[PDB]
């Protein structure tokens, strides 16, 4: 069985989204829907997913831009990994 989250997509742009927009970017299994990405994300980091945007990359992988609720802080969630 395949897992939903593959690993955190950490790049300069990913940082900007995290510091200024409270978003986390991830490399996810391309068969995963926004819904699944949202759930998998909350259960792994214990946060509140507000929105998910996906993109099938020219790297063969699927990227998810996950925005957390004002209640949570991306910068911190990402700092523990």
């Amino acid at each position: 069985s395949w897992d939903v989250i593959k690993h955190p997509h950490v790049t300069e742009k990913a940082m900007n989204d995290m510091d200024f927009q409270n978003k986390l970017q991830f490399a996810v299994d391309d068969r995963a829907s926004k819904g699944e990405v949202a759930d998998a994300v909350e259960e792994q980091y214990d946060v509140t997913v507000e929105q998910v945007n996906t993109q099938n990359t020219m790297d063969g992988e699927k990227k998810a831009v996950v925005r957390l609720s004002e209640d949570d802080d991306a910068q911190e969630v990402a700092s523990r990994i």
Partner: protein, 46 residues
């Protein structure tokens, strides 16, 4: 042109195969990528 998810996967792989033999492999083998494909000079399938 409008590409499908599959097509996109394939082009992606093709792009990746388009890298060079890493330097370390040179050293590990004591000494060429014959599948180098230029976008203009070469033509992919499909």
């Amino acid at each position: 042109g409008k590409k499908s998810k599959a097509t996109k996967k394939r082009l992606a792989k093709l792009d990746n195969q388009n890298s060079r033999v890493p330097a370390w492999v040179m050293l590990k083998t004591d000494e060429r990528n014959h599948k180098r494909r230029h976008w203009r000079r070469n033509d992919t399938d499909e």
